[PDB]
Design brief:
This is part of a larger assembly, with two copies of chain A. The first copy, chain A, has 400 residues and is mostly beta strands. In chain A, 0% of the residues lie in helices and 24% in strands. Chain A has no helices and 25 strands. In chain A, β22 and β23 (310-319) form a beta hairpin. Chain B: This is Spike glycoprotein E1. Chain B: It is found in: Virion membrane; Host cell membrane. Chain B: It is a single-pass type I membrane protein. The PDB classes it as virus. The entry lists the keywords eeev, pre-fusion, localized reconstruction, virus.
């Protein structure tokens, strides 16, 4: 009567199920968990990415105490070096003949590559989550409502009233703190902004793009510019945009107990083939077409016309229908066991009518609930040789 | 899918392997359509494709 389904996510080739009803004709669902998306309430904690030591010009004090005055960008590396007297054409600027100093100074500033192609941390909370889901319904055979994933607000679009969620499209495998580097979202904790994570994620930590301030524990180490040369060499640990895609933590575009893949995101959940959104529909008696205002199919028999073995649509099977009433006649197989493209089958008494479907097996022995009548549409399913369709129509290859 | 019932009897035949022998067949089938035929021994050689 009210076909709940926490059936595997599908997004690539919709899956189908059947509301059995004996008072009224059974009515189809196409439960398309196409968006398993998230709407976190979040906070940009820090961009990370490979640095650029766009050095401030060294505040060289050569004697009379060394003074290095700081300029914008917290975490300011400055190191005196002696035994080098500064030349640039043969020149000098140092102001002792008892000290030959070259004082190298370097701060971290965001790379220009940080602007475009970069890692991005987040403090991720559940927030005001939502997902949209198709239910084909009645004999209208389409309605795709979008409601909050937490139940909360039902919405009746077409015949069915459709409730999406609770939470199963409101969380990805994110932790509270996550760093993201590419497609791959990395469940990488840190104790808020203001912390140092050199040689990992948060080596650079800018809270603004095209930075003028950041926190850069990048393991920045100045070395001696030997032979009276004036330059600043920067020795620095690799970043969250120099690797961590094979020095990976938990690479979410390659792992997920949410059964999804993830991109460079404040956390959304792309392309889920399992991760089941628990779907709940409130379908009144009205939402069905009634038993005697539809056929009640009696004397039916099913045989293939030609099924296709593959969890993609194309399998067909005539059913030599014959009933005791006439009308419209919704059809569907019980669950994703056979996923039927035809939400509705036309029915005339003593005729024969092919419907469309998809199977996860070579024998199409799925019941089809033809307006208060099951029938096994057994026969022969000739595969399309080789299935390259991205996901199974069934929803997880649920067998007929 | 499977050819379900049928019975055959002459409508005057040949005593010869010349093609001229005919026989009506009260055919019936799981689904109506075409049905290629030939004797499965080839003792009757059938001109009907």
């Amino acid at each position: 009567y009210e076909h709940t389904a926490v059936m595997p996510n599908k997004v690539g080739i919709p899956y189908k199920a059947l509301v059995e009803r004996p008072g009224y004709a059974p009515v189809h669902l196409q439960i398309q968990l196409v968006n398993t998306r998230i709407i976190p309430s979040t906070n940009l904690e820090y961009i990370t990415c490979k640095y650029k030591t766009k050095v401030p010009s060294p505040v060289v004090k050569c004697c009379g105490a060394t003074q290095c005055t700081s300029k914008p960008h917290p975490d300011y590396q400055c190191q005196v070096f002696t035994g080098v007297y500064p030349f640039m054409w043969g020149g000098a600027y140092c102001f002792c003949d008892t000290e030959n100093t070259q004082m190298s100074e370097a701060y971290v500033e965001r790379s220009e590559e940080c602007s475009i192609d970069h890692a991005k941390a987040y403090k991720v909370h559940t927030g005001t989550v939502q997902a949209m889901v198709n239910i084909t319904y009645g004999s209208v055979s389409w309605r795709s409502a979008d409601v909050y994933v937490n139940g909360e607000t039902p919405a009746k679009i077409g015949d069915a009233k459709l409730i999406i969620g609770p939470l199963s499209s409101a969380w990805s495998p994110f932790d509270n703190k996550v760093v993201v580097y590419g497609h791959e979202v990395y469940n990488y904790d840190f104790p808020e902004y203001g912390t140092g994570k050199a040689g990992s994620f948060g080596d650079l930590q800018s809270r603004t793009s095209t930075s003028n301030d950041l926190y850069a524990n990048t393991n920045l180490k100045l070395q001696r510019p030997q032979a009276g040369i004036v330059h600043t060499p920067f020795t620095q640990a690799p970043s969250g945009f120099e690797r961590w895609k094979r020095d990976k933590g938990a690479p979410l575009n390659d792992v997920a107990p949410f059964g999804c893949s993830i991109a460079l995101e404040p956390l959304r959940a792309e392309n889920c083939a399992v991760g089941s959104i628990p779907i709940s529909i409130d379908i009144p008696d009205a939402a069905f077409t009634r038993i005697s205002e539809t056929p009640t199919v009696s004397d039916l028999e099913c045989k293939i016309t030609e099924c296709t073995y593959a969890s993609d649509f194309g399998g067909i099977a005539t059913v030599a229908y014959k009933s005791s009433k006439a009308g419209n006649c919704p059809i569907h197989s019980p669950s994703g066991v056979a996923v039927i493209k035809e939400n509705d089958v036309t029915l005339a008494e003593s005729g024969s009518f092919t419907f469309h479907f998809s199977t996860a097996n070579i024998h199409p022995a799925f019941k089809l609930q033809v307006c208060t009548s099951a029938v096994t549409c057994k026969g022969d399913c000739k595969p399309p040789k080789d299935h390259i369709v991205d996901y199974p129509a069934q929803h997880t290859e649920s067998f007929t």
